[PDB]
C-alpha cells in the first residue's frame, strides 16, 4: 500500500507541474501586453495568484530541476517581471505583494552561484522593474541584507547575472535620499572591487555596465 501511495504521489506532481508549466507559460507569453497586465491586476484573483506564485518558486528552489518544473518557475518569474514593467503593476506589487518581493529576495540568496542562472536573471529583472517605483526602491534597498545579497550574486561567473546585478545597482545608487546614513559610507558597502574588475571584462555589455556604474560612484 505504501508503494502505491508513493507511486501516485509522483503521478500527481508530474501532472501538477505540467498544468502549471502550460498555463503559466501562456500567461507569461501574453503578459508583455499592458492591457493584459491591467486585466490581471483586476480583482482579488491577482492577490491569490501572486501569493501562490511565491510559494511555488520557494517550494521548487528548496528542492535543490527537470524541464517541466524549470519552465514552470521561469514562467512565474517572467510574469512578475512583466507586471513590474507596467507602472501600475510595480505599484501593485509593492502595495499588495510585499511577501512575494521578500520571497524573491530570499530565493536570490538560496541559489548558489551557477544554479538556475536564468531564474536569477528573471528575478533580478523584476527587482529592477520594482525599483523604478519609488516605494519599491525604498522597500528593496531597506530590506535587511540587500547589499550583502548584491555581493553574493556578483560571485556568479555568469556574465548575464552580473550584468543584471549591475543594472539593479545602477538603479539604487541614483537615489541619494534612501542612502544608508552617509553617502560615502554607502559607496564603501558596495562591491567596488568586483565592479572595477568587471570594468575590464571581455564581455562588451558587462564591461560598459560596470564602467558606467563606476562613473556614477566616483561623482558622489
Amino acid at each position: 500500500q505504501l508503494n502505491e501511495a508513493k507511486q501516485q504521489l509522483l503521478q500527481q506532481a508530474e501532472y501538477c507541474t505540467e498544468m502549471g508549466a502550460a498555463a503559466c507559460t501562456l500567461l507569461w507569453g501574453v503578459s508583455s501586453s499592458e492591457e493584459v497586465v491591467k486585466a490581471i491586476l483586476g480583482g482579488d484573483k491577482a492577490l491569490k495568484f501572486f501569493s501562490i506564485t511565491g510559494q511555488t518558486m520557494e517550494s521548487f528552489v528548496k528542492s535543490l530541476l527537470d524541464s517541466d518544473e524549470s519552465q514552470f518557475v521561469f514562467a512565474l518569474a517572467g510574469i512578475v517581471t512583466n507586471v513590474a514593467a507596467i507602472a501600475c503593476g510595480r505599484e501593485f506589487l509593492v502595495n499588495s505583494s510585499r511577501v512575494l518581493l521578500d520571497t524573491i529576495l530570499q530565493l536570490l540568496g538560496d541559489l548558489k552561484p551557477g544554479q538556475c542562472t536564468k531564474l536569477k536573471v528573471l528575478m533580478l529583472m523584476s527587482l529592477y522593474n520594482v525599483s523604478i517605483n519609488l516605494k519599491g526602491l525604498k522597500y528593496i534597498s531597506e530590506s535587511p541584507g540587500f547589499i550583502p545579497l548584491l555581493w553574493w550574486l556578483l560571485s556568479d561567473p555568469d556574465a548575464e547575472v552580473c550584468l543584471h546585478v549591475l543594472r539593479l545597482v545602477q538603479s539604487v545608487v541614483l537615489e541619494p535620499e534612501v542612502f544608508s546614513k552617509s553617502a560615502s559610507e554607502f559607496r564603501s558597502s558596495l562591491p567596488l572591487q568586483r565592479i572595477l574588475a568587471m570594468s575590464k571584462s571581455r564581455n562588451p555589455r558587462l564591461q560598459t555596465a560596470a564602467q558606467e556604474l563606476l562613473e556614477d560612484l566616483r561623482t558622489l
Partner: peptide, 7 residues
C-alpha cells in the same frame, strides 16, 4: 527555453 529581452 529561450528568452527575448525587449526593453
Amino acid at each position: 527555453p529561450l528568452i527575448l529581452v525587449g526593453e
